Design a protein around this motif. Structure first.
Motif, PDB file in Angstrom:
ATOM      1  N   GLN A 234     -14.951  10.153   6.671  1.00  0.00           N
ATOM      2  CA  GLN A 234     -15.531  11.403   7.138  1.00  0.00           C
ATOM      3  C   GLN A 234     -15.258  11.528   8.628  1.00  0.00           C
ATOM      4  OE1 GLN A 234     -19.230  13.215   5.935  1.00  0.00           O
ATOM      5  NE2 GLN A 234     -19.768  11.383   4.745  1.00  0.00           N
ATOM      6  N   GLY A 235     -14.913  10.402   9.249  1.00  0.00           N
ATOM      7  CA  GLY A 235     -14.637  10.397  10.673  1.00  0.00           C
ATOM      8  C   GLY A 235     -15.837  10.909  11.443  1.00  0.00           C
ATOM      9  N   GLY A 236     -15.586  11.506  12.606  1.00  0.00           N
ATOM     10  CA  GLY A 236     -16.666  12.032  13.421  1.00  0.00           C
ATOM     11  C   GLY A 236     -17.746  10.997  13.667  1.00  0.00           C
ATOM     12  N   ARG A 237     -18.924  11.460  14.068  1.00  0.00           N
ATOM     13  CA  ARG A 237     -20.027  10.550  14.328  1.00  0.00           C
ATOM     14  C   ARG A 237     -20.389   9.770  13.064  1.00  0.00           C
ATOM     15  NH1 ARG A 237     -24.750  14.115  16.580  1.00  0.00           N
ATOM     16  NH2 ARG A 237     -24.252  15.033  14.535  1.00  0.00           N
ATOM     17  N   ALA A 238     -20.146  10.362  11.900  1.00  0.00           N
ATOM     18  CA  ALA A 238     -20.453   9.702  10.634  1.00  0.00           C
ATOM     19  C   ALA A 238     -19.613   8.444  10.418  1.00  0.00           C
ATOM     20  CB  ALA A 238     -20.247  10.669   9.472  1.00  0.00           C
ATOM     21  N   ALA A 239     -18.457   8.379  11.069  1.00  0.00           N
ATOM     22  CA  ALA A 239     -17.581   7.217  10.937  1.00  0.00           C
ATOM     23  C   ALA A 239     -18.094   6.099  11.832  1.00  0.00           C
ATOM     24  CB  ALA A 239     -16.148   7.577  11.319  1.00  0.00           C
ATOM     25  N   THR A 240     -18.544   6.467  13.028  1.00  0.00           N
ATOM     26  CA  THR A 240     -19.070   5.488  13.969  1.00  0.00           C
ATOM     27  C   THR A 240     -20.278   4.775  13.358  1.00  0.00           C
ATOM     28  OG1 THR A 240     -18.500   7.101  15.671  1.00  0.00           O
ATOM     29  CG2 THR A 240     -19.644   5.112  16.361  1.00  0.00           C
ATOM     30  N   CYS A 241     -21.031   5.506  12.536  1.00  0.00           N
ATOM     31  CA  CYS A 241     -22.197   4.953  11.859  1.00  0.00           C
ATOM     32  C   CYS A 241     -21.714   3.881  10.894  1.00  0.00           C
ATOM     33  CB  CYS A 241     -22.933   6.042  11.071  1.00  0.00           C
ATOM     34  SG  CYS A 241     -23.779   7.304  12.055  1.00  0.00           S
ATOM     35  N   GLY A 242     -20.685   4.223  10.124  1.00  0.00           N
ATOM     36  CA  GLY A 242     -20.138   3.290   9.161  1.00  0.00           C
ATOM     37  C   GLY A 242     -19.619   2.002   9.767  1.00  0.00           C
ATOM     38  N   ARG A 243     -18.882   2.091  10.874  1.00  0.00           N
ATOM     39  CA  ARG A 243     -18.321   0.898  11.518  1.00  0.00           C
ATOM     40  C   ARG A 243     -19.344  -0.019  12.160  1.00  0.00           C
ATOM     41  NH1 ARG A 243     -15.567   4.666  13.750  1.00  0.00           N
ATOM     42  NH2 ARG A 243     -13.496   5.342  13.014  1.00  0.00           N
ATOM     43  N   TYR A 244     -20.223   0.556  12.974  1.00  0.00           N
ATOM     44  CA  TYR A 244     -21.225  -0.231  13.674  1.00  0.00           C
ATOM     45  C   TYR A 244     -22.406  -0.704  12.832  1.00  0.00           C
ATOM     46  CZ  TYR A 244     -18.644   0.739  17.879  1.00  0.00           C
ATOM     47  OH  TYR A 244     -17.608   0.755  18.783  1.00  0.00           O
ATOM     48  N   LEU A 245     -23.087   0.228  12.177  1.00  0.00           N
ATOM     49  CA  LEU A 245     -24.255  -0.117  11.373  1.00  0.00           C
ATOM     50  C   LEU A 245     -24.014  -1.064  10.190  1.00  0.00           C
ATOM     51  CD1 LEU A 245     -26.131   3.310  11.243  1.00  0.00           C
ATOM     52  CD2 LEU A 245     -26.181   1.548  13.000  1.00  0.00           C
ATOM     53  N   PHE A 246     -23.019  -0.763   9.372  1.00  0.00           N
ATOM     54  CA  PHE A 246     -22.773  -1.584   8.202  1.00  0.00           C
ATOM     55  C   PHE A 246     -21.694  -2.643   8.325  1.00  0.00           C
ATOM     56  CE2 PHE A 246     -24.474   2.517   7.044  1.00  0.00           C
ATOM     57  CZ  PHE A 246     -25.648   2.103   6.427  1.00  0.00           C
ATOM     58  N   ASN A 247     -21.410  -3.058   9.553  1.00  0.00           N
ATOM     59  CA  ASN A 247     -20.380  -4.061   9.784  1.00  0.00           C
ATOM     60  C   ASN A 247     -20.694  -5.409   9.130  1.00  0.00           C
ATOM     61  OD1 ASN A 247     -17.787  -4.347  11.319  1.00  0.00           O
ATOM     62  ND2 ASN A 247     -18.901  -6.098  12.201  1.00  0.00           N
ATOM     63  N   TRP A 248     -21.920  -5.575   8.654  1.00  0.00           N
ATOM     64  CA  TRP A 248     -22.314  -6.829   8.034  1.00  0.00           C
ATOM     65  C   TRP A 248     -21.847  -6.943   6.587  1.00  0.00           C
ATOM     66  CZ3 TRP A 248     -25.422  -6.078   3.798  1.00  0.00           C
ATOM     67  CH2 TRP A 248     -26.072  -4.839   3.706  1.00  0.00           C
ATOM     68  N   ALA A 249     -21.629  -5.804   5.939  1.00  0.00           N
ATOM     69  CA  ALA A 249     -21.204  -5.791   4.541  1.00  0.00           C
ATOM     70  C   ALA A 249     -19.831  -6.421   4.295  1.00  0.00           C
ATOM     71  CB  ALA A 249     -21.220  -4.354   4.015  1.00  0.00           C
TER      72      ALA A 249
END
Ligand SMILES: O=c1ncn(Cc2c(F)cc(F)cc2F)c2ccc(Oc3cccc(-c4ccccn4)c3C(F)(F)F)cc12
Ligand SMILES: [Mg+2]
Ligand SMILES: [Mg+2]
Length: 560
Positions: A511-526
């Motif tokens: 989805q890119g945008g701010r929604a992508a930054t959420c995916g990379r930083y927040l769920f980096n543990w998965a």
């Protein structure tokens, strides 16, 4: 005197009240044991009343008085600004209880003629009438909890009309936002962010030869606050340089509203009289913090505790001092509780000396340590996730004014349970509803803020640092608690969350945008393939100051 006096009229609800968690297809993903989650209702009011009603015992002494003067001297340096009807109105939350004078929150924020005009008349009255007791409304508060090995009786909230509320801001907002700090300095807990609080607790802890600390829980603090206490509280405010109007308004509010007054239920029936602290007024947080600090600081001298360091958050107290030995410590603590009891601050559960900082629980939370990508230890603030989770489920099944789940992701971003359960569960739901950019209201230290979910990566990095996205290897104690808790509420196992996270992360990135930054930083543990998380641009371009200045819980404050 009696903290309360009741006429016999009932603390009546204001509408239909829900006590059971409704079954919603989304709630079960979080926890299966829904019958363990309940919301308090007015039906338990009586139980509460019996507990908060009692006569107070207060004996002041030379230590109490000494500390008081020390606080007054420091307050003397403060200069408070009178707020304009306009500034005050902008501070009113858009969902604050409407006035019984033909206007509500919206009107107040819209500087509506009717609203603004009644507020003026209310202010005028505060300047002319220095005696007539102001009417207050009493309600049973609805809060969600998880049943513990039975249930909790609703808490009682007392507040004046919207008109009065705005006037309170006009006269005391600048004071309650700057005085606490001026008087207690580094002891004022609301000046800290979760990371700064941990910094203060750890620094204070290491600065001791042989550290010893305890948390002091006062039995129903508000009802222990006496007419004397509230007048001592005002004496401190009166040390500020104030405008004549503000000064009179503080004197009148003290005599007509703060020391106590009549209580009316939702049906307009007289319920009784309050001779202690109201929960729904602007000076509640500031007053309890000042009052708790004054009593403890004096109690410590009386108990002959060595080199005490107070950390006060309203009625919440944690003390760190120099150990004088196991026996001596245990004795000094009991001496402290007696000094506190004389000061009219009896304990709920007797305090226990702690020699391990992680074991000390203050502000319903404790300090713990984990490790960052490098493997260096990182301290963070955590807490038992039971209530946060219980509420998260309730906030999923029903729409709610405030979002504790969001406030918890922010304050507890570094925590194992916040990153694994809350972020996953809620982001997955937001996507399903296509509502990532929708601003949500949540509270930090009692005050409301509207926050966009997609700004969570910046926020977290700003308040917690990038480590919040890489912490791992939590402590045995923290892991055990989260595990026990998650099992108790019937929360999906680790494996089930990792899978749900990998899926939400993937969906977000695409989805890119701010929604992508959420995916990379927040769920980096998965993912097994970790990512070199670098500083985020928007994160430095942030001003989260107002967030951690003072406490406003019950003060009806909203930061636009
Ligand atoms: O120390 C750790 N260090 C790293 N991770 C990986 C990890 C994170 F770094 C951050 C997250 F955001 C999710 C994660 F994965 C852990 C993941 C789980 C865990 O503890 C366990 C272990 C086994 C089962 C359960 C568990 C899970 C659900 C229900 C019952 N037990 C748990 C837990 F509640 F999380 F505490 C401990 C750790
Ligand atoms: Mg600050
Ligand atoms: Mg208490």
């Amino acid at each position: 005197s009696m903290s309360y006096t009741w006429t016999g009229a009932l603390i009546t609800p204001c509408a239909a009240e829900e006590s059971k968690l409704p079954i919603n297809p989304l709630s079960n993903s979080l926890l299966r044991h829904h019958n363990m989650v309940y919301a308090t209702t007015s039906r338990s009011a009586s139980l509460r009343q019996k507990k908060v009603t009692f006569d107070r015992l207060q004996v002041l002494d030379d230590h109490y008085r000494d500390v008081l003067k020390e606080m007054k001297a420091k307050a003397s340096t403060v200069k408070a600004k009178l707020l304009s009807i306009e500034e005050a109105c902008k501070l009113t939350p858009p969902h604050s209880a409407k006035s019984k004078f033909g206007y509500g929150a919206k009107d107040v924020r819209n500087l509506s003629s009717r609203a603004v005009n009644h507020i003026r008349s209310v202010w005028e009255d505060l300047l002319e009438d220095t005696e007539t007791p102001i009417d207050t409304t009493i309600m049973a508060k609805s809060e969600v909890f998880c049943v513990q090995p039975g249930r909790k009786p609703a808490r009682l909230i007392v507040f004046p009309d919207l008109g009065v509320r705005v006037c309170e801001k006009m006269a005391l907002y600048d004071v309650v936002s700057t005085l606490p700090q001026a008087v207690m300095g580094s002891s004022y807990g609301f000046q800290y962010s979760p990371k700064q609080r941990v910094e203060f607790l750890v620094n204070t802890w290491k600065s001791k030869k042989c550290p010893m600390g305890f948390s002091y829980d006062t039995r129903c603090f508000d009802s222990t606050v006496t007419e004397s206490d509230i007048r001592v509280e005002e004496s401190i405010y009166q040390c500020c340089d104030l405008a004549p109007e503000a000064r009179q308004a503080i004197r009148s509010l003290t005599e007509r509203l703060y020391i106590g007054g009549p209580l009316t239920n939702s049906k307009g029936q007289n319920c009784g009289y309050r001779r202690c602290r109201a929960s729904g007024v602007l000076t509640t947080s500031c007053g309890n913090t000042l009052t708790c600090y004054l009593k403890a600081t004096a109690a410590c001298r009386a108990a002959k505790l060595q080199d005490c360091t107070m950390l006060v958050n309203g009625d919440d107290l944690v003390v760190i001092c120099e150990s004088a030995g196991t026996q001596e410590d245990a004795a000094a603590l009991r001496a402290f509780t007696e000094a506190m009891t004389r000061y009219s601050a009896p304990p709920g559960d007797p305090p226990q000396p702690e020699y391990d900082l992680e074991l000390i629980t203050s502000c319903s939370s404790n300090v713990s340590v984990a490790h960052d990508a490098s493997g260096k230890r990182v301290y963070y603030l955590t807490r038992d996730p039971t209530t946060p989770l219980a509420r998260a489920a309730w906030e999923t099944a029903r729409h709610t004014p405030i979002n504790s789940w969001l406030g918890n992701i922010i304050m507890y971003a570094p925590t194992l349970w916040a990153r694994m359960i809350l972020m996953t569960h809620f982001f997955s739901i937001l996507l399903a509803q296509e509502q990532l950019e929708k601003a949500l209201d949540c509270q930090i230290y009692g005050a409301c803020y509207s926050i966009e979910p997609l700004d969570l990566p910046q926020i977290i990095e700003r308040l917690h640092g990038l480590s919040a996205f890489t912490l791992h290897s939590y402590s045995p104690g923290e892991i055990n608690r989260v595990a026990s808790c998650l099992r108790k509420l019937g929360v999906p196992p680790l494996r089930t969350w990792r899978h749900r996270a990998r899926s939400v992360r993937a969906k977000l990135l695409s989805q890119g945008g701010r929604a992508a930054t959420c995916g990379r930083y927040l769920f980096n543990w998965a993912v097994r393939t970790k990512l070199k998380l670098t500083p985020i641009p928007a994160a430095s371009q942030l001003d989260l100051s107002g967030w951690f200045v003072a406490g406003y819980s019950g003060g009806d404050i909203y930061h636009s």
